[PDB]
């Protein structure tokens, strides 16, 4: 209940915090002042459409790693076990794995951008 | 090839690193002599209870006691 | 705990519910199956804490694992259909009927 | 007692903070042939009290576009996660002793994340949009290496307890050890943060201040004080896990006192980091952070496994 | 001059060592002139929980000893 | 697609099912399963076409269901018993939602509206792979646990597929989906009886692979899709109608060959067990499904049709497709009726 | 259907060591050389019959070879192991590295005697 | 199962964790190992439907263990029962159980 | 502090139910990290702390990739929050009320057996080991590398093979 308590002093910081910002001040709202910026000119179009991602292989591989970091995880137990040659190979066998597949994305340019 | 890992010791020498030490980590446990007190350290780490046996009568080699003679003598972990 | 099993089922049943009910959106429904991913993982986590058997332990980490390989295959494939069609929607998927 | 000790841990760090500002400006003003605030103070020393004042003063902006829900929650998760980062912290006897405190630390940034990624899309706009992507793009590149680096570290510690760093480092640093992890943790808590060279969230002549665009006021403030909470956070990191302290049970604020100073250290670094050198690109980011850090990263790996093994160093469990 | 940053890096080192002194002290003064018991396994919760029954006041840190 | 790609693929496709039945675990059962998944959707989508992303889509987005509602039903029994394994005194509705996603994962009606679609978005081959090899373990399943499921559900979903393929196999003019939904009564076949000896399962799987295969590389020869290509055959290789009519009427089960011998034990089984009415049921819609091989046999091999200018060109020039085996495959169907007391 | 048997509450009352954790962990390591044999006969009987209830006076016996050992420590070098685990009850974690010169006094007072 | 590739070869890639009392890491007992046990050295030469009601009640007191319905049911009642004692006035609560015992060791 | 449990599990029913009513994928990827959150926590309070953690960042990393993907392709001009429409919010409001009238049901028709509110947090940890050392979630996962090795070569092939699956659909 400790930690619970920290966090919930740092959330009911944060809060008092905004409530301040928002009805200490004063206000003079008006369309002009609340519409979006895009440099002193008005934009042409709306920010929610399509904008083209062209890391996305990149971020699927990422996924992978991160999962791959879940599997490597586990060796600080896995290192106080009485085998310690098959988790040595296993290690091994993973670490090679997961190079190989970055050599293939990086020779057939995964790791290059969609232009 | 001399001239190739000579080029390549210049031109990435990130992958070079990588590869060396990769073929390190494989070679060298199968080099030292320390790496066979690793097994052992971590078998004789007791973490559960030893369970005592049973006098059949037909025990010589086991101990009687923890400090008699008999029984692994851990003093290969002394002085290591 | 039977609660909490019960409530976390409730939960699979609510996410399956929704990846089988479509909407517009395919990225809703690779969601609701990772929510169902996910409250498998837990129930089997749970199961294992409980019985104390860590031997299924290595289990959850291996759905984990393929559930994540789903979701990369998927939206690859979503991907694709953006290529093509540009817009998400699973309605202009129609064309393989005739 | 536990909220005294709340205070004790929370009112200075802000201090901290405050006066990382401060200090920022002015070595940036010396490395610039200029002298920093040395006016609204003695030598400066009330400025960062009048900037928060004066922001809090201000109007805060509620756009039409926006999510006003996202927009106004994510500062404060912001803030939140920087102030619970502090949390498990050894100097030397924490606040909190967990377990697993390394992987607190990553889930809390990884979850500190989202309050750029949501206040860039809550904010409707294009180069809040153009921040928020370059985030993610960002944590893309730096997650795997933070994590990969920090297991090759704690795999001659032998847990991810942070107070265990301690004994692990009673008679030595784990930076000679490991120079290239500390290395590539470094640029990793520089690509983290969102520090220059590695900004490109707020970068203020590529984007016109990304995902702050449309906030001005406190909510701003906040999102400005987590970041320099942050950084003390990482400094703070690398000098409990490569640069350790002496613990000396009996004279304990000794250690918290060379953890000052090398926190101190390395922050002013992190200074020195922003007045030196110009900005990366994002997509130079993703070539760097994978193809010359990852590849070193596994095969570091692969050597801090074989270690304690042919070295007979396996470490302890407790 | 470059010494007159030494004000901002003083408060802000003074601001730094305070955090961990600070419960130092704290847990020496609640738990007494003792260090904070951690738990990591279950079996120094046993001790502790052990202790606690043992002192007749429900505090693990009085610490009979041969007196019994 | 390289030669490094094909091999990590085709070793998945082929570890799958290899993983499912060599695992007595039914998380690694479930693993298998998910290879076959992923490992089948790149060659899905190779030709990149908007038919190839849908029928892709499809597929994945109906498996991947059926997987979770398969792990729900192992993570349901190790909650209850403990263990990996469907044992008896397991719940039925655990074992009914096992058999379920099987059959949404098999393309059994009344889960079979995806099957001919995704076999129409794909190349011949992959779907041979798709109505043959994918097939097995997903049977596998079943036929690791065949004294435990419902003989209900069993047999209205057998009841459903037999019906639901005969009726849609009648006005398909694309040949894809008349073996999508050929493979969608067959497998009703099976799954009738998979209670009931399952060795007849085996067999009637052993034997629809071996019509089918040959079907598909008599398609190859020429890409072959429609009514209207397959019956430009007396031109382009007329060779080939011999062995197409029998492994159709085959296929359909008329006597003399080897295709009705698994509807007939099947039916002999049945009625072993007193299941005379849905028996009868089967029996007499499997005439419909032959009624569509006829007018195809006819179109191609009793009526030769118009044909073209253009089809000389092909005269002119020399093949090498067929591989050696549909020799083999075509003639150990049609030909192996009376060696059935060694097949069983 | 078949009712549990238990111990009655005078089956259970004993003289019990009422000593802390650190007081402890100091004479553990001449507690399981002196007490060995009792203490290991408990053990086999606790694990080779899986019941409490068939070993309650082996834990008796174990309870009373504890009270005549830390008898002997308190008749003879009290002070040394005062000091010692004192010394030892000051960390988070009960570390022997920590106090390792009071070990010496302790070892060297209950050597010389017994 | 189906291949029995691991039967004929001797391998366990993965017969060798399929319950509860099999192989924990280090030897940490799960729950119900001995009635899993004993259930499964019931049911052994035996093969399923004559298993299923020669060894019912081993698997019953298994079923017990694990899942554990009887016991609720059982605490229920008496939790039941005590709270109309008590808001009848009936029950009185001793000291070691409102809060204050005598702690044994 | 009973039921801390029963309330975690109830807003880890709120967070998918909140996804299975489907709103753009950006308050969907909120649902689903608040209820890894969830299943962290609870996992933590069975005596779970690896997992827990791992889930929580497994699902983080992946609502990253979610939301730079749903910029791209999953994105209208008007995304459809749960308040969007009258229809979603009833039913949202409808499911809620529906689940609490379906305990306070199954509550009454079994005194006890499937759901106890009246014993509550009595049955979670189930006979811990009062007494133990080398015991907590870790040692299970570790067993990965030693007397489990076939669930980590064949994890290993499923992300090996998807990164050649991921390049040739993406081709
Ligand atoms: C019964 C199925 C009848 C389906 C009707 C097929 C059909 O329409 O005929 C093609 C017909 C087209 O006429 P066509 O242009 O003169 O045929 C060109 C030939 O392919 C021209 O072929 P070719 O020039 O290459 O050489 C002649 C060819 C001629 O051989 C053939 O092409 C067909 C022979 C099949 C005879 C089956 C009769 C039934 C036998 C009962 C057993 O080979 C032979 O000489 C036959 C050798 C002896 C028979 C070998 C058959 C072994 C398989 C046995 C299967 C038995 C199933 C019953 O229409
Ligand atoms: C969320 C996690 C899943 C839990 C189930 C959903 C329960 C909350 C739904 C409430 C409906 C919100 C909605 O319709 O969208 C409105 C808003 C969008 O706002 P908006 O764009 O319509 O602007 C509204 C303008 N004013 C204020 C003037 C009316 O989106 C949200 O509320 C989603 C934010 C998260 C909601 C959870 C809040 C938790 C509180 C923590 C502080
Ligand atoms: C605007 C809203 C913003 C909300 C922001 C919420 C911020 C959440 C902060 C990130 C938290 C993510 C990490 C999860 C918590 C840490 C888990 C952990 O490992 O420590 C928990 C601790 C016990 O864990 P452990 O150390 O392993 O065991 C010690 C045994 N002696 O002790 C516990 O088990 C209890 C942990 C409870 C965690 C409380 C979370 C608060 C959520 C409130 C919202
Ligand atoms: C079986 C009963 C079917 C009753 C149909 C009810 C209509 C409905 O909302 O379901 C369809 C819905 C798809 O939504 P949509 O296609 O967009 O419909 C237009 C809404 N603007 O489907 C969905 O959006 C998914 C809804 C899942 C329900 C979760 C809540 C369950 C508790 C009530």
Redesign the interface.
């Given at each position: 209940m400790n930690l619970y308590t920290v966090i919930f002093i740092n959330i009911l910081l944060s809060l008092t915090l905004i409530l301040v910002a928002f009805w200490l001040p004063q206000m003079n709202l008006y369309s002009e002042k609340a519409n979006p910026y895009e440099c002193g000119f008005d934009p042409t179009s709306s920010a929610r459409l399509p904008f083209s991602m062209k890391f996305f292989l990149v971020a699927i591989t990422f996924l992978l790693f991160d999962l791959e970091i879940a599997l490597l995880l586990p060796l600080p137990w896995a290192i106080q076990?009485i085998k310690t040659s098959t988790m040595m190979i296993m290690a091994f066998i993973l670490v090679t794995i997961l190079s190989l597949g970055l050599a293939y994305e990086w020779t057939q340019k995964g790791l290059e951008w969609t232009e | 090839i001399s001239a190739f890992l000579k080029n390549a010791w210049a031109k990435e020498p990130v992958l070079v690193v990588s590869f060396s030490v990769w073929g390190l980590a494989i070679i060298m446990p199968m080099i030292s002599p320390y790496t066979k007190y690793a097994s052992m350290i971590n078998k004789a780490t007791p973490?559960?209870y030893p369970v005592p046996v049973r006098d059949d009568g037909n025990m010589p080699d086991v101990p009687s006691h923890p400090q008699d003679p008999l029984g692994p003598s851990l003093d290969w972990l002394k002085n290591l | 705990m039977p609660s909490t099993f019960f409530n976390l089922t409730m939960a699979f049943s609510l996410s399956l519910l929704g990846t089988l009910m479509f909407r517009s959106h395919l990225m809703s429904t690779l969601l609701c199956l990772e929510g169902m991913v996910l409250s498998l993982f837990i129930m089997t986590s749970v199961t294992s804490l409980?019985?104390?058997?860590?031997?299924?332990m290595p289990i959850p980490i291996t759905i984990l694992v393929f559930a994540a390989c789903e979701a990369a295959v998927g939206l690859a494939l979503l991907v694709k259909v953006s290529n093509t069609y540009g817009t998400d929607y699973v309605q202009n998927l129609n064309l393989l009927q005739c | 007692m536990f909220f005294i000790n709340i205070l004790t841990l929370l009112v200075p760090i802000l201090i901290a903070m405050a006066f990382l500002t401060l200090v920022e400006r002015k070595i940036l003003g010396y490395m610039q042939l200029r002298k920093g605030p040395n006016i609204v103070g003695p030598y400066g020393i009330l400025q960062p009290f009048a900037d928060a004042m004066k922001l809090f003063m201000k109007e805060p902006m509620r756009p039409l576009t926006t999510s006003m829900s996202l927009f106004i929650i994510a500062p404060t998760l912001s803030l939140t996660l920087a102030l619970s980062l502090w949390v498990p912290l050894p100097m030397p006897h924490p606040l909190i002793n967990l377990n697993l405190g390394i992987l607190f630390i990553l889930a809390t940034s990884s979850l500190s994340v989202y309050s750029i990624l949501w206040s860039g899309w809550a904010s409707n706009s294009k180069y809040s949009l153009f921040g928020a992507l370059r985030a993610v793009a960002q944590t893309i590149s730096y997650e795997v290496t933070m994590a990969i680096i920090l297991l090759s570290v704690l795999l001659m510690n032998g847990s991810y307890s942070l107070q265990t760093l301690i004994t692990t480092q009673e008679h030595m640093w784990l930076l000679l050890p490991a120079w290239p992890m500390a290395m590539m943790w470094f640029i990793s808590t520089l690509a983290e943060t969102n520090r220059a060279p590695f900004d490109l969230t707020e970068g203020e002549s590529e984007l016109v201040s990304g995902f702050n665009v449309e906030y001005a006021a406190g909510p701003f403030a906040l999102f400005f004080m987590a970041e320099y909470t942050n950084i003390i956070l990482m400094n703070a990191l690398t000098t409990i896990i490569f640069l350790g302290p002496l613990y000396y049970i009996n004279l304990p604020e000794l250690y918290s006192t060379n953890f000052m100073m090398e926190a101190l250290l390395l922050s002013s670094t992190f200074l020195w980091i922003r007045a030196s050198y110009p900005r990366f690109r994002y997509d130079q980011l993703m070539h760097l952070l994978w193809k010359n850090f990852l590849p070193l990263t596994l095969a570091l790996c692969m050597w801090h496994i074989s270690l304690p093994i042919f070295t007979a160093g396996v470490p302890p469990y407790m | 001059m470059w010494f007159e940053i030494l004000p901002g890096l003083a408060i802000m080192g003074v601001c730094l060592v305070i955090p961990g002194v600070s419960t130092a002290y704290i847990h020496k003064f609640t738990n007494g002139g003792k260090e904070k018991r951690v738990a990591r396994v279950q079996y120094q919760w046993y001790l502790m929980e052990?202790d606690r029954?043992?002192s007749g006041v429900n505090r693990y840190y009085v610490s009979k000893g041969l007196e019994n | 697609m390289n030669p490094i790609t094909l091999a990590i693929i085709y070793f998945t496709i082929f570890l799958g099912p290899?993983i499912?039945?060599?695992?007595?675990?039914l998380m690694?059962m479930w693993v298998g399963l998910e290879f076959s998944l992923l490992a089948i959707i790149p060659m899905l989508i190779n030709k990149k076409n908007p038919r190839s992303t849908e029928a892709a889509t499809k597929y994945f987005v109906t498996q991947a269901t059926a997987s979770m509602i398969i792990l729900l039903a192992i993570v349901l029994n190790y909650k209850?018993?403990?263990?990996?394994?469907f044992q008896?005194?397991t719940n039925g509705l655990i074992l009914n939602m096992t058999l379920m996603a099987l059959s949404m994962k098999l393309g059994l009606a009344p889960f079979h509206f995806w099957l001919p679609e995704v076999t129409q978005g794909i190349p011949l081959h992959m779907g041979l792979i798709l109505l043959t090899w994918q097939k097995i373990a997903p049977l596998?399943i079943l036929?690791?646990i065949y004294?435990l499921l419902n003989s209900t559900i069993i047999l209205m979903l057998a009841i459903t597929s037999i019906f639901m393929g005969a009726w849609g196999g009648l006005n398909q003019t694309q040949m894809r989906k008349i073996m999508a939904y050929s493979s969608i009564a067959h497998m009703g076949w099976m799954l009738a009886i998979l209670p009931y000896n399952p060795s007849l399962t085996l067999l009637n799987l052993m034997i629809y692979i071996i019509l089918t295969a040959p079907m598909f590389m008599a398609l190859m020869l020429n890409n072959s899709m429609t009514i209207n290509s397959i019956s430009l055959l007396w031109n382009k290789t007329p060779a080939m109608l011999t062995m197409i009519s029998l492994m159709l009427l085959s296929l359909g089960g008329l006597p003399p060959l080897t295709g009705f011998l698994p509807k007939w034990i099947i039916i002999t089984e049945l009625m072993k067990n007193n299941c005379l009415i849905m028996a009868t049921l089967m029996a007499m819609m499997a005439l419909l499904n032959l009624f569509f091989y006829t007018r195809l046999i006819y179109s191609t091999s009793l009526t030769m049709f118009p044909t073209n200018n253009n089809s000389k060109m092909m005269t002119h020039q020399t093949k090498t497709k067929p591989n050696l085996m549909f020799s083999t495959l075509a003639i150990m169907s049609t030909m192996t009726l009376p060696l059935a007391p060694q097949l069983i | 259907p078949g009712i549990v048997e238990l111990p009655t509450l005078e089956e259970?009352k004993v003289e019990?060591?009422?000593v802390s954790s650190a007081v402890l962990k100091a004479a553990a390591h001449h507690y399981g050389a002196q007490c060995d044999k009792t203490n290991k006969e408990f053990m086999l009987c606790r694990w080779e019959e899986?019941d409490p209830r068939r070993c309650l006076k082996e834990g008796k016996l174990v309870n009373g070879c504890a009270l005549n050992f830390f008898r002997q420590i308190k008749s003879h070098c009290a002070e040394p192991f005062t000091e010692y685990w004192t010394c030892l009850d000051y960390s988070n974690m009960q570390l022997f590295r920590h106090c390792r010169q009071q070990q010496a006094k302790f070892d060297q007072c209950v050597l010389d005697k017994l | 199962?189906?291949?029995?590739?691991?039967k004929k070869l001797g391998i366990s890639?993965?017969?060798?964790?399929?319950?509860?009392s099999?192989?924990?890491?280090?030897?940490?007992?799960?729950?119900?190992h001995?009635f899993?046990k004993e259930w499964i050295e019931c049911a052994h030469g035996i093969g399923?439907?004559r298993?299923?009601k020669e060894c019912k009640i081993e698997?019953d007191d298994?079923?017990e263990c694990?899942?554990?319905?009887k016991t609720?049911?059982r605490?229920?009642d008496i939790?039941?029962q005590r709270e109309k004692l008590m808001k009848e006035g009936k029950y009185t609560p001793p000291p070691h159980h409102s809060g204050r015992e005598e702690?044994?060791? | 502090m009973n039921n801390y449990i029963f309330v975690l599990s109830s807003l880890f029913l709120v967070g998918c139910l909140g996804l299975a009513l489907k709103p753009s994928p950006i308050y969907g990827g909120l649902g689903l990290i608040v209820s890894g959150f969830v299943g962290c926590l609870m996992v933590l309070g069975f005596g779970g702390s690896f997992l827990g953690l791992m889930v929580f960042l497994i699902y983080l990393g992946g609502m990253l990739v979610v939301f730079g993907y749903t910029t791209a392709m999953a994105t209208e001009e008007y995304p459809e929050t749960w308040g969007s429409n009258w229809l979603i919010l009833g039913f949202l409001v409808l499911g809620v009320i529906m689940e609490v009238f379906l305990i306070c049901v199954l509550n009454y028709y079994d005194?006890?057996?499937v759901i106890?509110l009246?014993?509550l947090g009595?049955?979670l940890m189930?006979?811990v080991?009062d007494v133990?050392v080398?015991?907590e979630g870790g040692?299970?996962v570790?067993?990965m590398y030693?007397?489990?090795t076939?669930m980590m070569v064949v994890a290993g092939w499923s992300l090996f093979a998807g990164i050649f699956i991921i390049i040739e659909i993406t081709r």
């Open positions: 076990t | 973490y559960n | 409980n019985s104390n058997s860590m031997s299924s | - | 052990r029954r043992i | 290899v499912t039945m060599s695992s007595t675990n690694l209850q018993l403990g263990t990996w394994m008896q005194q596998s036929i690791q004294p | 259970l019990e060591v009422k899986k | 199962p189906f291949l029995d590739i691991q890639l993965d017969r060798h964790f399929m319950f509860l099999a192989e924990q890491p280090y030897k940490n007992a799960a729950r119900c001995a899993e399923g439907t298993a299923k698997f298994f079923e694990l899942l554990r319905y609720m049911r605490m229920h939790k039941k702690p044994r060791p | 005194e006890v057996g106890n009246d014993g009595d049955w189930y006979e080991d133990g080398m015991l040692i299970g570790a067993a030693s007397c489990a076939w």
